[PDB]
Amino acid sequence: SLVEWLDRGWEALAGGDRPDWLWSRRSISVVLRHHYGTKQRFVVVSYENSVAWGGRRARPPLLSSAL
Amino acid sequence: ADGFETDIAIPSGISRPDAAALQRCEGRVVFLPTIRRQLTLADVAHESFVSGGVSPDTLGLLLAYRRRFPAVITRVLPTRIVACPLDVGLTHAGTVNLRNTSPVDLCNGDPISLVPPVFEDVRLDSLDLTLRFPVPLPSPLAREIVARLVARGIRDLPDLNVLYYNGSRLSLLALGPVNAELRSLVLNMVYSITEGTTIILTLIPRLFALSAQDGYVNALLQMQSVTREAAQLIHPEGERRLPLYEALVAWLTHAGQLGDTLALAPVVRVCTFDGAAVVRSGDMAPVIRYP
Amino acid sequence: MLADGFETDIAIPSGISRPDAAALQRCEGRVVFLPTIRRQLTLADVAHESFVSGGVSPDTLGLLLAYRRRFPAVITRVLPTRIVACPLDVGLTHAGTVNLRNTSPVDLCNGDPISLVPPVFEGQATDVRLDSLDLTLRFPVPLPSPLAREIVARLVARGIRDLNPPDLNVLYYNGSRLSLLADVQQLGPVNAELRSLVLNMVYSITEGTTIILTLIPRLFALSAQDGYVNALLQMQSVTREAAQLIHPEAPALMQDGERRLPLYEALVAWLTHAGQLGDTLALAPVVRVCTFDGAAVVRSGDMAPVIRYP
Amino acid sequence: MNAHLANEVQYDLGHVPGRPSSLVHVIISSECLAAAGIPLAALMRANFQVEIQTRAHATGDCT
């Protein structure tokens, strides 16, 4: 995959790696929401490989907006 | 002069075959209770290591050699055995010849630790005692060869016999009584590691249950980091209580007991000068201790 | 080590009340932490006032990390103008022997390695004060090496109770009953001790360890037959009650199991992290005891010959 | 970033309150921070401790 070709380009130019560079390469879900208090916007994020809101590995138990 | 020499007196009554074996054992490692000028040979023999009742096993010989003091025999008079201790007498002289009982060859610049004769015998008839000489094999092999023999004992409840050092074969199997002589070391391994791998698994209740290869690294790195966020990354916070914190201390002492046993510190380094670098079996090797 | 050795000199300030001069002559053999291996220092550098951290007085458990950052040295002879000491990490003397006076409740045996502990025990808390120079001197207690690994294990396990809103005070050695004085522990250095644990805790777990975990039903069956196996569990271990409930079994089959030895790789990684950890919390046992005129017991309050331990 | 990921470690180890509860990541905008509360130059003066609770519906039982 070209993702592995990306990873050598980051490792060579930075001289190292953190997970901050790991999550930016896979994908990201960046969603506008708006605040009930002071009308301003804010962003809800679910990473790809994460355990949180929408996550590639960890969705037991997934939650519904049915109520 | 100012060189220190222990003098071991032989009790009289030696038969002519018995002195010939003691004539032959010139460069070997010999332990002794305390550094002293004059001393009997009864404290040298293998019979002096007993606790009962019980001839000591491989575990006790590792424990004894910390408290016993290593010495290398010099020239052997018919009157007395003159030996110099390694830890005090060698710091002035600097060079002591040493013959291998090991079948493994020695390169130049190697660190050498001492191993009890578990890898695999002199007994005196007239004086009614036995002699067991430890094996001077190199220290990187010493953490290996001990751990290979432990790995065989776990299989008692692929080939482990392959050990190739500096272009030579070794056969650990070569049998019967070697396995039962080593049985006490095997049980203190498994009891240490399984008590290790329950307390860590109780303090962190989801090490194995955590997701594989990516969340575990993220759990590793924050624990691996230096920053102040330490305790909230660890702890999970009538009926009986698991005595975990007492089981911490009893396991740490047992782990702390085995640290002194299985270090196998480099007592001896060999510096070959005016000769071949490879020192083979049955050859006197010069010894230089740390300055 | 040099041919003559290396001897530091700790100079004494000139303002001396004569009772404090005789107090220094009782410090004939003690252990002194040097920050450097500089040849000339002062008593203010040695004493407890410079031995504090920035703005914060260290506790007993936090004082261990302050030790391993510094250099333990032993006073040889007290002179009227200065104090001559020899470092331990540097090769110690021309001759290889030092005298060490026991400021310790416990007698010593031959060959046993000495690690050193802060003043911890009740009653015998003794700190020399130099009231003309307004100085305080806290001197460490030399102890045998399995005892020091107990005391660190008693202190560190005490601090883990403080993160969780009985009992652990009493030790035993040579039949002596003795407890230890401690009130609080700073939350800073406990995390430094605990992070040093759990990283070394994790690094013992390898693929062969789960194969070793299948032998837990074997030991609890074997402790029925031999009392030597009963000498393991002691009823306070987890593994006795862990074997009563969990019946584990092996995974199968291992990836590339033909080329590799999983039980061998688990042991060597265990010997370098968990069996190493007795060195990682306290400092190293640099010194053992070799009496020359053979005294099997070095009594509490007496000197002893001293030789380095690898 | 690093605080965004170390909090994912908190849910994995179970230190968070509530096992059926799930984790939600939020980027607060600076303009949302101003009109609601504290000034912005104060947080400029690298992780910051924030205490968080959950309040149940219509009955005063909070975490």
Side-chain angles (χ1 to χ4, degrees), chain B residues 8 53 76 87 120 136 145 152 164-165 167 176 182 190 210 229 232 244 250 252 256:
Chain B
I8 298 168
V76 178
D87 290 331
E120 191 271 330
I145 294 170
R152 184 179 293 171
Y164 289 172
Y165 183 79
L182 193 143
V190 181
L210 211 150
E229 299 175 351
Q232 294 178 356
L244 298 173
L252 287 174

Side-chain angles (χ1 to χ4, degrees), chain A residues 20-37:
Chain A
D20 291 329
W21 287 278
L22 285 174
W23 295 99
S24 180
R25 287 190 293 270
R26 292 182 183 271
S27 69
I28 191 165
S29 66
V30 183
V31 177
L32 288 170
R33 297 294 298 165
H34 295 282
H35 181 69
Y36 287 90

Side-chain angles (χ1 to χ4, degrees), chain C residues 18 36 46 51-52 82 85 96 125 151 155 157-158 171 198 210 215 218 233 235-236 245 248 250 255 264 279 294 306:
Chain C
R18 186 175 292 170
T36 55
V46 167
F51 182 64
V52 82
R82 65 188 183 274
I151 298 169
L155 289 176
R158 183 173 291 175
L171 288 168
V198 187
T210 60
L215 204 143
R218 185 63 60 85
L233 298 174
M235 192 60 205
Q236 298 295 320
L245 296 173
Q255 181 178 2
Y264 177 73
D279 184 74
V306 152

Side-chain angles (χ1 to χ4, degrees), chain A:
Chain A
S1 68
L2 293 174
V3 180
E4 182 67 28
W5 294 105
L6 294 173
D7 296 335
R8 296 179 183 177
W10 291 99
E11 182 67 27
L13 290 175
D17 200 1
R18 293 177 180 180
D20 291 329
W21 287 278
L22 285 174
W23 295 99
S24 180
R25 287 190 293 270
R26 292 182 183 271
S27 69
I28 191 165
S29 66
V30 183
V31 177
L32 288 170
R33 297 294 298 165
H34 295 282
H35 181 69
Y36 287 90
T38 57
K39 288 172 63 66
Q40 295 301 109
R41 69 183 67 189
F42 68 98
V43 177
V44 173
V45 172
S46 66
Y47 289 166
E48 181 174 358
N49 203 4
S50 67
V51 180
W53 180 254
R56 184 179 175 181
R57 297 186 182 183
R59 295 180 178 93
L62 76 159
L63 64 96
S64 175
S65 67
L67 191 63

Side-chain angles (χ1 to χ4, degrees), chain B residues 20-263:
Chain B
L22 294 175
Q23 186 66 40
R24 190 177 62 247
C25 63
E26 294 291 327
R28 287 178 183 177
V29 178
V30 161
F31 292 94
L32 51 88
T34 56
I35 285 97
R36 194 179 173 180
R37 295 294 299 270
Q38 293 177 355
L39 183 63
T40 64
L41 195 143
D43 292 332
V44 170
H46 179 73
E47 193 271 332
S48 177
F49 293 100
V50 302
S51 295
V54 171
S55 67
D57 53 355
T58 62
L59 189 146
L61 289 174
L62 289 171
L63 286 167
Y65 292 169
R66 295 295 181 186
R67 292 180 182 177
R68 300 289 186 183
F69 291 145
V72 174
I73 302 172
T74 63
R75 65 184 185 273
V76 178
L77 277 74
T79 71
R80 65 187 183 274
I81 292 174
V82 177
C84 61
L86 292 174
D87 290 331
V88 54
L90 182 54
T91 62
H92 184 73
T95 300
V96 169
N97 292 319
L98 179 61
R99 181 178 293 171
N100 285 317
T101 62
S102 66
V104 180
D105 296 333
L106 296 181
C107 295
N108 195 3
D110 293 335
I112 289 93
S113 68
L114 47 90
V115 175
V118 191
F119 180 79
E120 191 271 330
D121 293 332
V122 176
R123 184 180 63 83
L124 295 176
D125 292 331
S126 298
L127 278 75
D128 197 5
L129 54 92
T130 61
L131 292 175
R132 292 187 182 179
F133 296 97
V135 179
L137 59 92
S139 65
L141 294 174
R143 293 177 181 89
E144 295 182 353
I145 294 170
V146 171
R148 297 292 177 92
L149 295 174
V150 173
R152 184 179 293 171
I154 302 170
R155 298 292 300 274
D156 292 330
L157 298 177
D159 290 331
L160 293 172
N161 294 318
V162 176
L163 283 167
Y164 289 172
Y165 183 79
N166 66 14
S168 178
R169 293 182 64 191
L170 290 173
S171 66
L172 297 173
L173 182 62
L175 188 64
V178 179
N179 197 3
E181 187 70 25
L182 193 143
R183 186 176 179 270
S184 66
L185 285 173
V186 179
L187 299 176
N188 282 317
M189 297 295 177
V190 181
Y191 179 73
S192 61
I193 296 170
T194 55
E195 188 175 359
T197 58
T198 49
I199 296 168
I200 316 159
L201 297 172
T202 309
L203 294 176
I204 313 299
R206 293 181 67 186
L207 278 179
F208 285 106
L210 211 150
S211 295
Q213 288 185 355
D214 283 327
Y216 183 79
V217 174
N218 292 317
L220 184 65
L221 286 174
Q222 298 294 321
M223 183 178 69
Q224 190 176 2
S225 64
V226 189
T227 63
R228 59 182 296 276
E229 299 175 351
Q232 294 178 356
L233 292 169
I234 293 168
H235 295 291
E237 180 176 0
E239 296 177 354
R240 66 180 61 85
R241 182 66 59 84
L242 293 175
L244 298 173
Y245 292 157
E246 292 180 355
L248 281 171
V249 180
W251 180 70
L252 287 174
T253 57
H254 183 74
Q257 184 66 41
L258 294 175
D260 290 331
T261 66
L262 294 172

